[PDB]
């Protein structure tokens, strides 16, 4: 029903989910930058 309504009101979704994934990818790196600055212990990847 969400894809049917998105086609109904002409919603671009590949823009939207990638716009969310970029925010989550930025939040992952902001999470990993908290550790070596304010803890002074080595980064993990």
């Amino acid at each position: 029903f969400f894809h049917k309504g998105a086609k109904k009101s002409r919603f671009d979704l590949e823009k939207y989910n990638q716009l969310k994934d970029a925010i989550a990818q930025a939040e992952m790196d902001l999470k990993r930058l908290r550790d070596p600055l304010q803890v002074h212990l080595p980064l993990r990847q």
């Binding site: 029903f1 049917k4 309504g5 998105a6 919603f11 939207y16 716009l19 925010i23 790196d29 930058l33």
Partner: protein, 50 residues
């Protein structure tokens, strides 16, 4: 630079979520009613055999 990068990605989210929440509200409106309708098919069959 990453918090400045996240700034623009948060700025761009605000207009596009409006149509998203509208279509989500409008599509859940059928899912709730089809759940109650799936209850209704079970409800009427208890009636017609009584």
């Amino acid at each position: 630079e990453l918090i400045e990068r996240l700034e623009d990605l948060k700025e761009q989210l605000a207009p596009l979520e409006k149509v998203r929440i509208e279509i989500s509200r409008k599509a859940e409106k059928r899912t709730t009613l089809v759940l109650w309708g799936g209850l209704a098919y079970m409800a009427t069959q208890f009636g017609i055999l009584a």
